[PDB]
Structure formats: structure tokens, C-alpha cells
RNA sequence: ACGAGAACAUGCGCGACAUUCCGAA
């Protein structure tokens, strides 16, 4: 799929030298927000979840600033733009699809290592 | 005599046994259904005269989303000039859709068509559930596992049959079937098997075939004639003898559970050139009540 | 004359339920066609019979309820407990959240001699699941309906405080009964006053 | 006249609890950390067997003391003893969930350790998932009153087990500071039967 | 008067044992 294509394109060292230790903070934040959404039973993302997604976006920006490998990962995978899309649509299904996309991304990145 | 189609859709899997608790049959003969009906009538304290005198029923035949299946006639079929093994297809065929019934009688069904018909049946899946008995454990013993062979139908599959009789018999059968939905049919009814819901309606699709005249007659139920009719009805016949066995399911027949007398009946699909009217035989051996075995003949005429 | 009462409802899985029966380590019993978890009616019948025998204490009432094959006193089973199938509402709820119907539980067994933990895998039905249960009570005698139903209430209470399958002394098989309806489907008996749980 | 005694209450975590499933066991439905009842029952049985006395050369759990087989059950052929204690899975309590939603805790934490070789002194790092200290679990136990005269004594044994569990861990490596828990019993009532359980207590 | 009737796939079993987030400035 798209994750397979982008990981293969960035494979040569993946995403200019990205590892799971670099991503662990973003993964923890993403799965925390995912579990908070999972516990709730609503078709729309709540206000606190929206603020947490904004915090996740700013964490994405901070991690891109910190590391070049994380920066090129974010640029190539459209994860921040996907977060913006999830915020705009405000649908739980779209958020779950984004979480599945991120999980598939990480799985493929580990697979090609 | 009005023919009513009774369609049975099964909620839970059913345990139709032939000789063992592990056997998973997909159908029951007219004997099992008639015994269930008699038990239901005794439960509801109704009269047994209509069941024992004016009810003619067929076996429980499969049906799926597309067609109703009738038993394969035991007719002499001709294959190709060198296709000796192709006959085996017609040997493995058990049920034919009604639309393809007459074609089979005329000999226009090939071996490949017979295999297609055999594989086109979508009744359900037969499985074997393994259970245990922990009653001996509390008495310093061991658990005793056993097996129950069940058969679960596909969502739009089920078992249909045809009933023939007067208006009073038809109505009494409606009440009996309504009670039988919750009594259940088959094996472990009290242990979670045999529950179904039935619908009784008219059958134009089957009245088209039951009004057909021909040179041969096909049995639609497990039947047998008395001696006088058996004298002249067995010439040029192609049949299959089935050994009807079992224990008497009754709380007042005797002290302990005992078997009933061995019976032999012609199968469904047997072809005769003489139509014999069966009866309801007694397979009781000096019991409190007479155990009945229904072997009346529901006939379907056809051209060979 | 003759009456049959239909008791439909839901069995809610309080803790992971394992009723034994591709290659899976200790798989649960399933519907052969839909491959959906089921609660066999034999399991419920046997567990309630054992609980009621413990409570009363075979006893005559157990013979009236669950039937007897004893010589001389051949008793018909008044309770027909059908298999509990995976609920459709629970099916939709589990299809949402991307949740599987069955979970895999990993357990240890620490040896009393070498202090070495032997692993073991079992399969359970997830705690969010529900099963549609259907029971038919046959009124063979009208005078014992109240006694039979109070015995059923006692058995259901014991079952709700007990497990239903697998090793429930180690936190498995806890269940709850929700009685959707108790309606007389056959006969003229009035089951409006009757209640279970 | 069958009797069942229902003991409900809270297991309060004191140090990070890790019961493996290095992730922890979670309920698939709610994705919250869980305490399997098998873990509690096994730890209690092991502690009670050690305290009461372990037969030398013992190989099976069926060779425990008669009190342990009476309480936690025995499976020996012929002498099949049904377990009186049924320890259910302890689920993440809703009060702890509300308390964790405030201050924005994740119900769980990742603890970083390392192993230092004796010779090379190389610290190989590792991570273990734990349940946060403030978390609480709803524990539910059912005691089967089979013999009247042995009820009180059995409860004494249970009390001893609890007194050993509060001084021990529950899962993972508790010799290094994990799994320490405390039991607070909300109620002990005879849920089934006419038995009088007012005087019974396990703490 | 259903190859039927009675029959808990169930009893025992800790995902546990050893492990410094440390050397360096």
C-alpha cells in the first residue's frame, strides 16, 4: 500500500536513519490518544481529544525539528497533514484509519530493517 | 386431499441419528417425523385418528436459496458409449431440484450434470461436538467424554416436506407443527438441538409435479405395502430396503428403555409400476401401548 | 392442557469464557458454519444441574427439571436449553473497534520442585461479548410450575455467582443473565407472574 | 443448602505492577490493564503452601497440605476436591480511571532498566511496561461453603494468604520493586444461602 | 410414541525466575 511504497522509497538505512527509539515518543502519544478515543463511544472527536491531537501535531513539529530522520519521515509520510485531516473531519473512523496507517508504517519500517 | 408445503428453518444444529450418537444425518424419514407428530398429539391430548388414518407425508427433503430438492428416482439410466465410471455420478446423486426432476426422468441429465447437481446442494455443515459427563467425578470417579454428531444448516437452507389430507387433518397438523417448533426434532432436543420454526403454505411448484401422470411411480417417503399389495406391486421394481431400528421413546411403554421390533421399508425414490398404499405398522412387543411405524406411500408419477 | 414457556435473553460475559471443544491452543467451541463462539446448551444444562444438586443436596426435582433415564422412573426433561449463539448486536459492536471475538490468554505453571514456569495458552471469549440464549420450559404438570421456576431461579443465581466453562476458579467463565422475555408460546398457562433472576 | 460468600474490594497498587501477556495483560474490550485471577490464586496458593509447609521432594500441586487442597482445589485421581476459592479477574476500577483522566495519566508506564555485565560492564538496556502506582483494581472472590465446621478455619487460611500477599508482590519481578499491592475489602456478605458471614474477615 | 433417554469438555496450574539506565567528561 502507500506505507509500503513510502518505506520502500525511503529504504536504502530507512528515512535518512530513523529508528524506533527516535519515534517512541510519538508512538506513545499516538497510542495514548488512541486508547482515550477507544474508551469513549462517540462518532465525533471530543474537545479534549481535539486539543490532544493539536498537542500531538506540535510534538510532531518538535520531533521534526530535533531530528533530521524524523523530519524526513514526517515530510514523506504526510502524518501531520493526516492529523490536520482528522481534525477537520472530526470523525472517529478517520482517526482510527490514521492510527492504522501509522501502525502499518511502523510495522513496514521494522520489516525492512 | 390438499397438498401443503411445510418448510422448516432450524435455529440450532440438529442431531439426526441413524444408528449412533455420533451420526450426523441431514434429514429424517417420514417415520421420525410421524413419530414426533404422534408424540406431540399425545402431549396436547388430541385425537390420533387423523394422523393414523388420513395423513400422508413425505420425507424431510433439503431446500436451499434457489430450489427444492426431491429424492433421486431409482431409474435405469444410460451413459455414454465408453463412460463406465460416469455412472458413479448417478450413484452419488441423492437429491435433484424440482426444475431438473423431469429432465432426469427423461434421461437428459448427463454425468457432468449429475455431478453439478450433487455439488449444487448447499444444505449445511455436519460436525461432531465432543461433550463430557462429570457425574462420576463427584463419586470419586472420572469424566466420561462422548460425541454428538450435529448438522447445522446454511442461513437460507432447511428441510421441507409435503402433507396430504383433508381440511381437518391439515389444521391438526398445523397445530402439531406449531408445537413441534418448540418440542424439537431429532436427538438431543433437551440438550440444545433440533429447535426450528416452520411455515405451512400452499405449493403450486409442487402441485405442478403432483398433478403429472406417467408410466412410473416414485416414492416420496419410506413406505411398505401389506402382503396383498406386495404380491403384485413388486414386479419390475427398482427399490432400496432400509432397516428402521431404534429404541422406544416413551415414559409409559415399560419400566426401562427397550428397542422396538426391526422394520424394513422401501426408500424414498424407489420406482414402482404399481402404486401401493402403505399403512401404519405396529413395532411394539407386548408393551403398554402400540408403537407406530408410518410406512404409507406418498407417490409422484413420472414418465421414464 | 400442555404448555411451553419460552425464556429468551442474553448471557453477558463478565470474564473471559472458555468452553473447550486452524490449529489453536485450547480452542473454544464454535458454530461449524459461521465460526462464531457458542455456549452449548449441554454446558448450561449440566452446570445448572450440578449447582441445583449442590443446593438441594438424584433428587426428584432435578429429575423433573433435567430429565432422568433411571429404570422405572423415566422422567422427561422439562427444560430444553438451546445453544447460546453469539449475539448480533455484540457482533456489530465487536466489528466496530476492530475487536476479535476471541482472545488468547497466556498462563504459567510454576513447578513445586524446580521453580520453573511452564507456559500454557488458552482461548477465551472476550468480556464485551453477549450470547442470545433460548430456553423452553415444558409444563408437564401445572402444580409444580412455581417450584420448578423457583428452582430455576436458585440455579440462575448460583450460576451468576459461579462460572460457566473452563477453569473458573482462576477467573474464567463469569457470566450474567438478562431475561428479555418470559412468554408462554404453547398452551394457555399464564407465565406473566413467573420470573427468572 | 449451598452457600456462596462474596468478597468484593480493591487491590491498590503500591509499586508498578507488571503481569506479562514487555507489555502487560490488558482486557481486549476496554484496553485497560488487568490482574488475572489465575495470578492472584497462584500467588496466594504458593505463599500459603510455603507458610503452612512444603513436603520435601514435592513435584505436583496436588501434594500440598490438606488445607491448601481444600481451599484452592485438588485434581488427584479419586480424591478430586473442588476448589472453594474462586478468584476472578481484577479489572481496572472506574474510580481509578476517573482519577487518572484528571492529571492525564495513561493507566500505564514504561520503566527503563539495564543489565550490567560483571566483566565487560556493558549495560544492555531494556523496557518493561508497568501499571501506575495510583491505579486500583476491583477484586471479586467467591468462597464456596461446602463444610460448615471448616468455614472459619478456611477463612483464617485466606487471611494468612492475604497477610502474605500484602507483604509480597503479585506479578513480574517483585524482588526488584514491582507488583507490591494492598488489599482493602469493601464487603464480605453471604451472596448465596443462609450462612452468617458477619464475623468472617480476611484482614 | 423422534437410534432414543441421562450426561458441564471439565478438575489442578502466578507469564514467572536472574538483570544498577550505568562507564566517560
Swiss-Prot record, chain A:
- Give the record's GO biological process terms: defense response to virus
Pfam families, A to Z: Csm2_III-A (PF03750)
Q: Which UniProt keywords apply?
A: Antiviral defense, RNA-binding
Write down the InterPro entries for this protein, in alphabetical order: CRISPR-assoc_prot_Csm2_III-A
The domain of life is Bacteria
Q: Which NCBIfam families match?
A: cas_TM1810_Csm2 (TIGR01870)
- Assembly with partners or alone: Part of the Csm effector complex that includes Cas10, Csm2, Csm3, Csm4 and Csm5.
* Other notes: Encoded in a type III-A CRISPR locus.
Q: What does this protein do?
A: CRISPR (clustered regularly interspaced short palindromic repeat) is an adaptive immune system that provides protection against mobile genetic elements (viruses, transposable elements and conjugative plasmids). CRISPR clusters contain spacers, sequences complementary to antecedent mobile elements, and target invading nucleic acids. CRISPR clusters are transcribed and processed into CRISPR RNA (crRNA).
Name listed for the protein in its UniProt record:
CRISPR system Cms protein Csm2
Gene transcribed to yield this protein: csm2
Curated annotation (Swiss-Prot), chain B:
Q: Which Pfam families match?
A: Csm4_C (PF17953), RAMPs (PF03787)
Q: Which UniProt key words apply to this protein? A: Antiviral defense, RNA-binding
GO MF annotation, one:
RNA binding
User: Which InterPro entries does the entry mention?
Assistant: Csm4 (IPR005510), Csm4_C (IPR040932), RAMP_III_fam (IPR005537)
Q: Coiled coil located at which positions? A: none
What's a BP term from Gene Ontology annotated to this protein?
defense response to virus
Q: What else is known?
A: Encoded in a type III-A CRISPR locus.
Q: What does this protein do?
A: CRISPR (clustered regularly interspaced short palindromic repeat) is an adaptive immune system that provides protection against mobile genetic elements (viruses, transposable elements and conjugative plasmids). CRISPR clusters contain spacers, sequences complementary to antecedent mobile elements, and target invading nucleic acids. CRISPR clusters are transcribed and processed into CRISPR RNA (crRNA).
Subunit record text: Part of the Csm effector complex that includes Cas10, Csm2, Csm3, Csm4 and Csm5.
The Swiss-Prot or TrEMBL record describes its family as follows:
Belongs to the CRISPR-associated Csm4 family.
Q: What is this protein called?
A: CRISPR system Cms protein Csm4
Give the species.
Answer: Enterococcus italicus (strain DSM 15952 / CCUG 50447 / LMG 22039 / TP 1.5)
UniProtKB/Swiss-Prot annotation, chain D:
Annotated InterPro entries: CRISPR-assoc_RAMP_Csm3, CRISPR_Csm3_endoribonuclease, RAMP_III_fam
Q: Which Pfam families match?
A: RAMPs (PF03787)
Any idea which GO molecular function terms this record carries? endonuclease activity; RNA binding
- Would you tell me the protein name for this molecule? CRISPR system Cms endoribonuclease Csm3
Alphabetical GO biological process terms: defense response to virus
- Relate the assembly described in the record: Part of the Csm effector complex that includes Cas10, Csm2, Csm3, Csm4 and Csm5.
Query: What's the stated role of this polypeptide?
Result: CRISPR (clustered regularly interspaced short palindromic repeat) is an adaptive immune system that provides protection against mobile genetic elements (viruses, transposable elements and conjugative plasmids). CRISPR clusters contain spacers, sequences complementary to antecedent mobile elements, and target invading nucleic acids. CRISPR clusters are transcribed and processed into CRISPR RNA (crRNA).
From the broadest rank down, the organism's phylogenetic lineage runs: Bacteria, Bacillati, Bacillota, Bacilli, Lactobacillales
Amino acid at each position: 500500500n502507500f506505507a509500503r511504497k513510502v518505506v520502500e522509497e525511503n529504504k536504502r538505512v530507512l528515512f535518512n536513519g530513523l529508528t524506533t527509539s527516535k519515534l517512541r515518543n510519538l508512538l506513545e502519544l499516538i497510542n495514548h490518544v488512541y486508547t482515550k478515543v477507544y474508551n469513549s463511544d462517540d462518532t465525533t472527536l471530543s474537545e479534549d481529544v481535539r486539543d490532544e491531537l493539536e498537542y500531538l501535531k506540535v510534538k510532531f513539529a518538535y520531533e521534526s525539528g530535533r531530528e533530521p530522520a524524523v523530519r524526513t519521515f514526517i515530510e514523506k509520510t504526510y502524518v501531520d497533514k493526516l492529523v490536520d485531516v482528522v481534525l477537520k473531519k472530526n470523525t472517529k473512523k478517520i482517526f482510527l484509519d490514521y492510527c492504522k496507517y501509522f501502525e502499518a508504517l511502523v510495522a513496514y519500517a521494522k520489516f525492512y530493517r | 386431499l390438499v397438498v401443503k408445503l411445510v418448510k422448516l428453518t432450524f435455529k440450532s444444529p440438529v442431531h439426526f441419528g441413524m444408528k449412533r450418537l455420533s451420526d450426523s444425518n441431514h434429514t429424517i424419514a417420514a417415520d421420525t417425523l410421524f413419530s414426533a407428530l404422534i408424540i406431540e398429539a399425545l402431549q396436547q391430548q388430541l385425537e390420533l385418528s387423523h394422523l393414523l388414518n388420513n395423513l400422508v407425508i413425505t420425507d424431510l427433503f433439503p431446500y436451499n436459496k434457489t430450489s427444492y430438492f426431491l429424492p433421486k428416482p431409482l431409474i435405469r439410466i444410460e451413459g455414454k458409449k465408453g463412460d463406465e465410471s460416469g455412472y458413479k455420478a448417478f450413484k452419488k446423486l441423492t437429491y435433484i431440484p424440482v426444475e431438473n426432476y423431469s429432465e432426469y426422468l427423461r434421461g437428459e441429465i448427463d454425468s457432468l450434470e449429475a455431478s453439478k447437481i450433487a455439488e449444487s446442494l448447499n444444505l449445511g455443515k455436519a460436525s461432531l461436538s465432543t461433550k463430557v459427563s462429570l457425574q462420576a467425578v463427584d463419586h470419586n470417579g472420572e469424566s466420561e467424554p462422548y460425541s454428538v454428531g450435529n448438522f447445522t444448516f446454511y442461513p437460507e437452507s432447511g428441510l421441507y416436506f409435503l402433507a396430504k389430507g383433508n381440511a381437518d387433518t391439515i389444521g391438526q397438523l398445523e397445530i402439531l407443527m406449531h408445537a413441534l417448533q418448540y418440542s424439537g426434532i431429532g436427538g438431543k432436543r433437551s440438550a440444545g438441538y433440533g429447535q426450528f420454526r416452520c411455515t405451512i403454505e400452499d405449493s403450486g411448484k409442487f402441485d405442478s409435479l403432483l398433478s403429472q401422470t406417467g408410466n412410473i411411480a416414485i416414492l416420496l417417503s419410506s413406505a411398505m405395502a401389506s402382503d396383498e399389495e406386495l404380491v403384485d406391486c413388486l414386479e419390475d421394481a427398482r427399490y432400496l430396503l432400509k432397516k428402521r431400528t431404534g429404541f422406544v421413546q416413551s415414559k409409559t411403554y415399560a419400566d426401562q428403555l427397550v428397542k422396538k421390533k426391526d422394520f424394513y421399508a422401501f426408500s424414498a425414490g424407489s420406482t414402482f409400476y404399481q402404486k401401493f398404499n402403505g399403512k401404519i405398522f405396529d413395532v411394539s412387543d407386548n408393551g403398554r401401548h402400540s408403537v407406530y411405524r408410518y410406512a404409507k406411500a406418498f407417490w409422484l408419477e413420472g414418465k421414464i | 392442557m400442555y404448555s411451553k414457556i419460552r425464556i429468551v435473553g442474553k448471557i453477558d460475559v463478565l470474564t473471559g469464557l472458555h468452553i473447550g471443544g486452524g490449529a489453536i491452543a485450547s480452542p473454544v467451541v464454535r458454530d461449524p458454519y459461521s465460526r462464531l463462539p457458542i455456549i452449548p446448551g449441554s454446558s448450561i444444562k449440566g452446570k445448572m444441574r450440578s449447582l441445583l444438586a449442590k443446593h438441594i443436596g438424584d433428587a426428584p426435582e432435578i429429575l423433573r427439571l433435567f430429565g432422568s433415564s433411571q429404570k422405572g422412573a423415566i422422567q422427561s426433561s422439562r427444560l430444553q436449553i438451546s445453544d447460546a449463539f453469539f449475539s448480533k448486536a455484540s457482533q456489530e459492536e465487536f466489528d466496530k473497534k476492530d475487536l476479535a471475538y476471541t482472545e488468547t490468554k497466556f498462563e504459567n505453571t510454576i513447578s513445586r520442585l524446580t521453580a520453573v514456569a511452564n507456559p500454557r495458552q488458552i482461548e477465551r471469549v472476550t468480556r464485551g461479548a453477549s450470547f442470545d440464549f433460548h430456553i423452553i420450559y415444558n409444563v408437564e404438570n401445572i402444580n409444580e410450575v412455581m417450584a420448578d421456576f423457583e428452582n430455576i431461579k436458585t440455579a440462575i443465581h448460583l450460576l451468576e455467582n459461579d462460572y460457566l466453562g473452563g477453569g473458573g476458579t482462576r477467573g474464567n467463565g463469569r457470566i450474567r443473565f438478562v431475561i428479555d422475555s418470559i412468554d408462554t408460546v404453547v398452551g394457555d398457562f399464564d407465565s406473566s407472574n413467573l420470573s427468572i433472576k
